[PDB]
Amino acid sequence: VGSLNCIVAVSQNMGIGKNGDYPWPPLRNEFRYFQRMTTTSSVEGKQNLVIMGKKTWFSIPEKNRPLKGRINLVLSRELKEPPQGAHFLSRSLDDALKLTEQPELANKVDMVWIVGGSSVYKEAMNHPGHLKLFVTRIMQDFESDTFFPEIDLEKYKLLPEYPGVLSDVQEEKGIKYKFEVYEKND
Ligand SMILES: NC(=O)C1=CN([C@@H]2O[C@H](COP(=O)(O)OP(=O)(O)OC[C@H]3O[C@@H](n4cnc5c(N)ncnc54)[C@H](OP(=O)(O)O)[C@@H]3O)[C@@H](O)[C@H]2O)C=CC1
Ligand SMILES: CN(Cc1cnc2nc(N)nc(N)c2n1)c1ccc(C(=O)N[C@@H](CCC(=O)O)C(=O)O)cc1
């Protein structure tokens, strides 16, 4: 019960993963940016909630699990309890959001960040209400086996700027990328 946002890093051909990992070499400032966006809460004494499907939870290195300073929720219909290190397990995105409204969490969470994977995004994308997409455009093609859903530009507007988000083209390990913010309201 705060903002609902999706954050993703996409190659030119819309890939986000390849054999359980992201397709390019590690980009430390892309990770630094992902960490600060998802960890920074807007209010005082609140923490943001991160929602992720199971394959995404297992692609984070064990040392980095759970993602520090955030409430980590995993989506799965197969698991019986949250994986080791996870704070909550939900069977569906609606239940994950119905949970935020439990007195439990109702007072602790600021923003909800959808961090993947593809089915998770596809659904938050069609979910109604106000939604922002924070897209990292990796400007090169990468062999992938999982993709980000098509952004409908009649519903999503690309913003010209956003506070805290660099506007220039970045480059790291010879890969250029840029940060984009899209907003919907329906
Ligand atoms: N570049 C980037 O930004 C990102 C890259 N990644 C990478 O992308 C790929 C992750 O892949 P993807 O296959 O899309 O995986 P998810 O992380 O979406 O895992 C899919 C599993 O999560 C559960 N799940 C997914 N959607 C839901 C739902 N709506 N309700 C309940 N359970 C759900 C199901 O678990 P079950 O079968 O147990 O029911 C499903 O088998 C990896 O390669 C990862 O490293 C991931 C995130 C962002
Ligand atoms: C598999 N993967 C998914 C992944 C990677 N890049 C992304 N980039 C963005 N922009 N959006 C995403 N949703 C995203 N997700 C991972 C892998 C590692 C960590 C992770 O270790 N993150 C640390 C960052 C520490 C660091 O490398 O600086 C954290 O505290 O956020 C996160 C996501």
Ligand 2 site, residue 59, Cβ cutoff 6 A = yes
Tell me how far apart the alpha carbons of residues 75 and 13 are, in angstroms, rounded to a whole number.
26
In this structure, are residues 167 and 161 in contact, taking their beta carbons and an 8 Å threshold?
yes
Half-sphere exposure for 30 (CA within 13 Å, toward CB): 26
The crossing angle, in degrees rounded to 10, of helices 93-100 and 118-126 is 60
Measured in Å, residue 35 CA sits from the centre of ligand 2 at 7
Q: Say how many Å lie between the CA of residue 33 and the centre of ligand 2.
A: 9
Angle at 82 between CA 90 and CA 63, to 5 degrees: 125
Cβ distance 127 to 4 under 8 Å? yes
Strand 109-114 to strand 88-90: parallel, antiparallel, or no bridges (unpaired)?
Answer: unpaired
Solved by what technique?
Answer: X-ray
Residue 106 Cα to chain centre, angstroms: 21
Point out the annotated binding site.
9, 15-21, 30-35, 54-56, 64, 70, 76-78, 116-123
Q: Which uninterrupted H or E stretch holds 104? A: helix 103-106
Contact 84, 107 (CB under 8 A): no
Ligand closest to the CA atom of residue 180: 2
Tell me the two tokens of residue 99. Answer: 């949970």
Domains of the chain in sequence order: 1-186 (3.40.430.10)
Q: Quote the tokens at residue 68.
A: 């520090």
Q: Which amino acid is at 136?
A: T
